Structures are given as C-alpha cells and as structure tokens.
Amino acid sequence: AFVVTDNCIKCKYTKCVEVCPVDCFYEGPNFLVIHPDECIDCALCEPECPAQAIFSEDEVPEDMQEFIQLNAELAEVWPNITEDKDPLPDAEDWDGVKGKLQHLER
C-alpha cells in the first residue's frame, strides 16, 4: 500500500487521484487517504503529489508511522474520490508546514 502523510493536510491538491488505476483514494474535508486493501502499489501517484506527501508503506518516515494506520481507518469512513478538483484555497501557504495532523478534520 501507498500512504498519504502529513503534508497533504490543508493542501489536498488531488493530483494523485488522476493517475490511480483502481480509484482507491478516499476524501476528507482537508486530506486524502489511500485504502490499503485496494491499492495495487503501482506507485504512479507519488510523483504526482505536489506536496510529496505520498510514501510506500515501507518508506513512510519514522516520525510519520501513525499515518499508515490512519489511512486504513479513515478509508473505511470517508467517501471515494475519483475526479480531481481544485486545491484547497490556501494550499501553498500550508505546503511544507510541519505538524499538520493537529489540524486534521474528520
């Protein structure tokens, strides 16, 4: 599975969903997650993320290991997103700010 981590929050560019062959991204108000059972690890999304927030599970940074379980949990409750849309209004002000998990919205 590929995993969306911290830098997506408050950015949510949605470029990643274009390239997904199996449509396994699920949408939250200010963040996206990958459903781990559905992802086929084709890795096509992680060049596309402008926030460089997507990682192969086995490459998730040590300080971001919570995101693996979080993607699994939230994928079950959020709606499937299959079309990209516009980025959040202020996405590049937040691009690269650290510690954005305290701002996640369910």
Per CB under 6 A, 24 contacts ligand SF4: yes
The DSSP symbol for 13 reads -
Q: Which stretch binds ligand SF4 (CB under 6 A): 5-13, 14-22, 57-65, 66-74?
A: 14-22
81 binds, among ligand SF4, ligand F3S, none (CB under 5 to 8 A by kind): none
Helix spans in the chain (H):
16-19, 66-75, 91-94
Establish if 39 lies at the interface with ligand SF4 (CB under 6 A). yes
Contacted entry of ligand SF4, ligand F3S, none for residue 40, CB cut-off 5 to 8 Å set by kind? ligand SF4
Nearest to ligand SF4 of 43, 97 (CB atom): 43
Start-to-end Cα distance in the chain: 22
Rounded to whole angstroms, what are the CA distances from 33 to 5, 41? 8, 14
